[model samples]
Target chain A: VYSMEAVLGAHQKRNEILAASSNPLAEGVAWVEGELYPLSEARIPILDQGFLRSDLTYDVPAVWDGRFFRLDDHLDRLEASCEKMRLKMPMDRSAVRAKLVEMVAKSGIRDAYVELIVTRGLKFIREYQSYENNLYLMVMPYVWAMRPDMQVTGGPAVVTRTVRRTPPGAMDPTIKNLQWGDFVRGWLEAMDRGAVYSLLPDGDGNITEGGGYNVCVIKDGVLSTPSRGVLEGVTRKTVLEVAAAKGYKTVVDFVPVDDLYHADEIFICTTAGGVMPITELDGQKVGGGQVGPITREIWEGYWEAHYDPKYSFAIDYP
Target chain B: VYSMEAVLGAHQKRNEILAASSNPLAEGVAWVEGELYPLSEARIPILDQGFLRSDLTYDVPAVWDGRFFRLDDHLDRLEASCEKMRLKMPMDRSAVRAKLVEMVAKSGIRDAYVELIVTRGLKFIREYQSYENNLYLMVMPYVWAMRPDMQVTGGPAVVTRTVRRTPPGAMDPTIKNLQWGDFVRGWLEAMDRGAVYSLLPDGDGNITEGGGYNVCVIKDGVLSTPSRGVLEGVTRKTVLEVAAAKGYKTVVDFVPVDDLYHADEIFICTTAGGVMPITELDGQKVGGGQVGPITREIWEGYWEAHYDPKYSFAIDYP
Candidate 1:
């Protein structure tokens, strides 16, 4: 029911306003409501459906060495997610991309974590229409799910039966969302067990994912991760490509908990922290209690890709 | 790991500040961070975990004729939810009760819809711990899931298969949180089908609930609702008691979608709306296409129970 003319007109008006309000280069800058503010000071109304009902979708992409890695891929997934959730982006894809660069450039941080969100904003009609949605962008210092030290030492991991990942049929995991109760609960159990991270099954005895990362297991020289009930992570995609290029067989399918206990090598990947190895499972050593040869090779290849022009988009820092 | 003396000291200090800073009576007042603001003006930091991760639990209890209905029950459930989620309330229960009264008293609205939320507050730490949590309370004009006119005439309803409720095993529905992706998606389908509301199956072929209400089916003098995979709504509890008082057999168990299509009466109960009938399901007449006699009787009895002193708490209007 949207006409092209109306969309074009609105897009031009929004683009003009955004271009006119270029902000000064400052740390922790955020773009909200067509304006800029410090990330620490940005706020959303308490009554926003996004806040009260989790009626929103978001994506996070990290900046490293003054460049963004696979940013177009992130935006592509964001658009697909919006389509699946029936949410309309407040602006066109080009405009949103430009806004992300602007936010990161103004932050003046070489390495940063950028979060872009679209909320089913504030409405009073008491009906289920995607009206009055909001867009929020924030760039802060880089975040690490697994710090550099842990990345090399290989963090301890656990598979928790206390909490299960939400099944795809119930809540589509493909669309990035704020539904983290299960993940948080599982992480708590892992913490209690002296593990750095936890992998949750899908209630059907299949491993899904950890808190904010995807799990990968290597056994018999085949790399595998759960094909369903998990986010199609970009980092996971990168790892698969890297593995294939290095002449390793990669498989995306149901990975049962039993596979993790006997895996030769195990690692997790995410945008926040590219790739980190898992050394112990439930207090048991994983394949000789050290990061495996395959894990080390893949980790090196991932960081090396960060400097590759094909994967990195340089930020126009002010 | 909490001590009695420390808890008592903190409780007293919080109570003193809250009591000393009471605001004047006004419409749409909210209590946030121990201060009162107009509901329209209340905002939460964008980074608050409640908004970003949906890492919180909440409850809503409505007021009628200057009194709160089932306020204690709501608070009890809120406490249990916090415990299950490993979140600590910012204030003691007594202080919270008094704060609620103060918030509603300042609002000065006779018929009001009140929402209380506790969020896993902002933190920069790289670990999952329940520190710096926040409590938010807001009072606004009453909301109606099914308006009075629709309650009498009966509204259209649908059973959506495109979206399913989050299974209890994955995300406990007993703890009320902001994970409403399934609910909102189902509601959009219902709106497209010309229905007033929707009932989502739990992916196991059993009916769970509508967006914010619980579904009930009456057949052969038996009243039944899904015992699991659904929120234990206070209003649903009231309706069950009302049915029992009228000598109707009540069953709390799984209800399949087929049963809904064959039921003699179908109704939903919620805090915002007492009891409303579903006259049409999937474009087909629901038990003669009008509000049933049993539904009308139960609705009247449920509203009458609102005035019972044992259940009602009067707000001290300023």
Candidate 2:
């Protein structure tokens, strides 16, 4: 549904702005405490409940070509997470939405990795919860979870031995909070096994998510991913939507550990890097140990959907 | 075990130091990045994986008459936690011990609430985990979780309907890390119910823990607490040991909702406030609905143990 003209127009405008300023982390583009700071400057108090107690929830979104891809959708997800985590969204979503696209448009970095975080915030009379919430958002010259060159080299993976995803009851993995203790363990586990990524099970051998990303399995041409016991990743949602629109079968269900071994193709999906093909799991090959046709089709559709004005909300720039 | 003379000597020195300085968070008493600042000045970088990713584990110890209570035990727990969470503990016990005692002694605070943290540290190459780990320690004027004033008012409690402890496989809850999202929810649930504390089940119908504190119930004059599926709290251990030394029947086993409802008495235990008596659980009175005889005796013993010099460790100072 995205027109090449709108995308090309955005690309041309982005190039002109990029030529105007080279520093991606420009002041005012990074924010903290309702004020602008050099992307290098923003800081939070030590007593901040977010830092002190890990009482926080956060979300990340990436730029496609020159426009903010699914900015509103990401913010919507952030809002949902805030309510579930019961964090005070001190900053308005309308304001966050405005500042976000404005920063990207002004930063002149067409391709950027943007993130907005709502911390439970600093201390007060109440010690259990933060006094007020702090909204910290930053846009940097894109960060790639998987290098473009290696998307074809080797996909990352790990078995279900060392660490498992923090269960739903403990932290509500659905909230997309900054609690990455489990994720780090999973990543290190994969790194040790010489794979590029890690995935954790629901403790009883059902797959959940990989490092900061969602996992999808293709079996008999039917696409399936975990619907419960996971973060409900925005990018994962987008990929599933893209697959459905492209006439592919989709199922939101438990992806068993055995599925990884039998799947024709597997892909790790996240905002920073969309549709990263998982060509292998542990030491075994996953579907010829190469990027599959379905992933490529979804990958092309997923990136292009950002330029589709009919679907994507445009970032208003002057 | 400690000598009475040594305890007196330490107590006198603590009083003299208290007369000399007033600020506990005084400069050089709190630290970050290898440098000391006023306890009020200690701050962490926003980019720190500890703050950004919550990839950290921390422990709190309370001061009694200027002595560090169970400092060694807390460190042991922190060490085990760091291993389980794969966190870096760049500082050795010798160094952490020296810095901790030094900060407490210099702060001029006889009764201090101390927090020592090991963060996965500053970010660099790997986004999932940090290359280095930072150790942060701070001592402040006595901060109480349930408040010293609330010891006799109402031992608070909330059931496991809204929030549940993260199961072992998602994250070993045994690791005392900063993932408090579930806890904040549990706390709010208690707050809504007009209770003082929140407790969650392990999703399989067993009581686990209550917001940084462990819950224990007395049944038939026998003392029992949740033995598994929870973090083994330091203060809880002390109380158990105290109970056993005094000849009370002790049990460390699964505590279900039924146990909570039918207990003769209940106690909420923590290092900061040992043996806090709960007369009510969800508005139902327990054991005369006042601080029980056993709890009162244990509380008195817990506090006096600081002065006993027999069961308590003497924090050395110049």
Candidate 3:
């Protein structure tokens, strides 16, 4: 029963099973094939194109103090990603929004890391033809690229030339797919250099991104980030909004790696950890090797926006 | 119990449970986490980096008439791939070979498509650091890119400019990872043009590959294939060997898209379907619009080598 309806039916069955459970919050939860399972117990068929071909798109929006920050923006970006990848949405925007709210409410877990994934689902006889597309929702504890301990002074990062970002011509990094081959390679290189994170450049030596987070450099009082070969991150958007509103001359353009070496300050932005400074690059100090004033201001501003009702939605836990 | 030991223990339990089953060769079978399951039932944890990050490598070798074609060669390439990607093999070559044979024998699936995968496994607190690596073996019915119906007349293919192949610097195509982003994009482009396969070129307009199979062109008695940005396929190696032995000049160099447009003959090679011809490119006839003699001769030669005792291992079906 690998038909499209059967696939949807499986998802429904899983959702019903999860809905029947008495426990409201269980540390981590996942909804797949229309059913719910504990995070650790959740699984996908190995034959799935999502796993086999990495044919999927995902968005991670964090919930803080029972509120989802910029959820609409995240969903909007997700919709754009689906359109770019040609993956049809299994349900409308309201339905998806309701499902996310339902899952978060059921878990009763605030400060959650919520991920929504739409995989191309099971492949039919052809390599690309799928029986149907699949939607998955997972809620886990919050993760931080820059932990609380390092938030004050900022974390160490390395600019890796060992691997370049997969060019936009081949992969639209904007979609946030599972193609982390380059990221893993650069991360390994970073680990070898005693750094916590890695920044990747394109083949032309322009810094693209950290693969997940968007990298920005502040040089000569001008804030600039790589305009290409990077994800249009929701937090990146927040950073831009905070910076622009706070009277910073911001520019989104191709940023060279050499700019990182000479920059007064450097920082990365992501939904996982918000705005975090990079105090070091390639074993060298960055702007006195401390959290810069601009970075701290943006971090504070990002948190301030989290509580702003215009940008945040409070979940009704059942 | 998300420790390395627990992960290995789970594998052992799964393997033991699978080994205890009385029925063998139930259409399709998969061995994972040290346990066997029916192919349909086989699953991997949703959080596995293999699925989450496309952080894995795989190799597929076929068994024909209960004999494995180029098993050692496939394993050799898989080892090289793992080394290049920094993924450690969970077992020795002999053990992996034994696992493959056992899976195939247990299923009694002669004329099988055997897939071996090594995933980066579940991540720990850090994004890339894993609890343990995982190895999986699956035996399924044989698959063909160019089916029997189209083999005689050859198949239609399209040259896609919509998406370029990911450069070797970012993600090496030689490793056979699950990064099929470019391929899927190209395939979609092909489908739009009513073609069965899509060939992708580098940014410089040099044809790289079909994402999966090695694409080749014959012009002026010179057979050339892209030496860079492609999998060093076992079947590709066989094609070169057969062509060279048969007094054909082989050039492993950068081949331009123009070569494909004006070629006297075009063919693709892979373990999935051996040598297949491209009778038409982007709706235009390719060299008399039929399977050329060179393609036919190589196809015959490849199958002949399949049965050769030196190249294939006879499976012991218990």
Candidate 4:
């Protein structure tokens, strides 16, 4: 029964179902056959100038149990990034939330990854802003699978020969643009050295972050990381939330390689890899080369909250 | 008579006439109509990536009056640049010369600029070269007119904040690629500084050259310039030839700002500007604020060679 047009028609039918769904905070929306649709049907262009030229700025939803966790915090960061980059978001926060819930209802799925992207449209050249702006709301099937070795033994870190980052003076570090060539180069160098990730140092020799993730370490039973110089990763924020709940002290400070090498435990935080412990630094193992109890506890807490039935919603494909 | 296609057809007709001319070495050629025709009718795509991207590289006969001054030297440098950049020369030297003569004959143009350009072809992008190569050939009219004030008191020297050069390590200085953003930026900056042209410096704080000209300075009775860090201007080469003929000791040395400020005579050389004496640097007058005797002598000798009757050839348009 799934002919070409039928397959395409399902996209439209799902959108109508979500528009009338019980969830009122569905602010994120996409289109199917010129009608508002769920996020699953929205396709992002691979060659979009945003991805091609590193011109895109975005924010990822912090989801737990098929629900956005700390949605306000994520939206704040997104707004800040857009303001700093001079990118104007087309829709307001309330509208975005309403559309997201609508999309979730229509998608016929429970777990999802929500990505909100704002880009200067196809004709974007060197300019920072353009009259034509594109807003993309992508809802993808979300999977959080940590390798057994990574979870139990922890991941290794490498010090790359590549400079940590471009100086802040050349480009503002606060905006999350796709200009990640330096990070990719550093990551490749680290992989060549048999490490899961590379720690980048800025041109002036200050430690920054791993390829696409933020760095953190446990020193004297306290969670500490480089503050202000790197992206404030959402997962890092979640770690703070769990730590606060569990009565552990968290510190945002400039922790150098020396601090990391001697730390009792080290971990990286990002959307894809929640709280991954770092067992080795530049070939030296940290704290007996195993994931610490704190990292595991935080990871478990994140998943439990994410999959809780009360917060989760299922889509109706119609 | 001059409809677009007709103009193209007439251009092709002229190319055929030149291709069959008496001297086999005078066969003009152009890449057009899916075939290589004589130069008189050859037309390239205006929107071709070569022209659009300014990705073509060229060498021209720095003609003076009617003569191809130092034609062999110019060709040698051209070939060297092409070899260094790994660009393929589509036609042999003798055939190219034939094409040049035939083009002149067909166009009925005399005392004009003769240019040979090698553009990165649309096909060239598939080769091992970077996406920045285009080969082309064009001959056009040349006009030289001195300002009334320049004729009486010689050219004025205006110091510019815009530096004339780029870092040597990033891109080779010898190849004349159309990646001229830096030059264009410097030119605009010089205009803002109320100067006619810009003098750029390398990252090492050493003076390189004028925006499109080579710097020549006569200091303490010796002619010197910043060497090995700029385009070998055709006029500069001519000036050196003239210097050698006059028994003037020409030194290819590094002349810093101090040397330029204190020089007895300072000048810039280019294909279009020829040899223009600089009477000021940073608004300070040099050598009594007039073109020096040595500078005039070099200019006179250059004109004599350029206007020689033996090298002069007339075009015979059909």
True contacts kept of each: 0.74, 0.65, 0.80, 0.00
Error of 2 at B313 (Å): 5.8
- What tens-digit string does per-residue lDDT give for candidate 1 at A1-318? 122234224434543544455344344777777888887788778878888888889999888767898998989898898888767888888988888888787766667788888887886324436457778888876777887657767899898877888877667898888778788887788888888789998877789997899999999878999899999999999999998888899999999898898999999999988888899999999997888888877877776677789999788765
List of clashing residue pairs for candidate 1: none
lDDT tens digits, residues B67-98, model 2? 66877788889989887766668888898888
lDDT of 3 by residue, B251-301 (tens): 999999888999999999898877888999999999999988888778777
lDDT of 4 by residue, B1-318 (tens): 322234324434644654555643243334332344544445454223343223345676744333456666667877887775456777778777766666654544434456676755553222324534444555544423223235335555454443335434323567655444345445545555655556666545457775557888886667787786688876787788788788788988676766767788887777654667777666678787888878877766655556455433333445
Error of 4 at A246 (Å): 2.6
Per residue, candidate 2 scores C-alpha lDDT tens digits across A201-288 of 8888788986678889998778999998888887888888889988889999988988788899998888876778888687888888
TM-score of chain B of each: 0.90, 0.88, 0.90, 0.76
CAPRI class of candidate 2: acceptable
Poorest 10 consecutive residues of model 4 chain A by lDDT?
Answer: A1-10
Identify the superior model by DockQ, candidate 2 or candidate 4.
2
Give the lDDT ranking, best first: 3, 1, 2, 4
Residue A122 miss distance in model 1 (angstroms): 0.7
Q: How close is chain A of candidate 2 to the true chain A, as a TM-score?
A: 0.89
- DockQ for candidate 3, C-alpha atoms: 0.50
How close to the true structure is residue B103 of candidate 3, measured as C-alpha lDDT?
Answer: 88
Q: Please give the lDDT score at residue A236 for candidate 1.
A: 96
Ranking of models by DockQ: 3, 2, 1, 4
- Whole-structure CA lDDT of model 3: 0.82
TM-score of predicted structure 4:
0.49
- Candidate 3's C-alpha runs over 4 A off are A1-25, A124-131, B1-26, B124-131
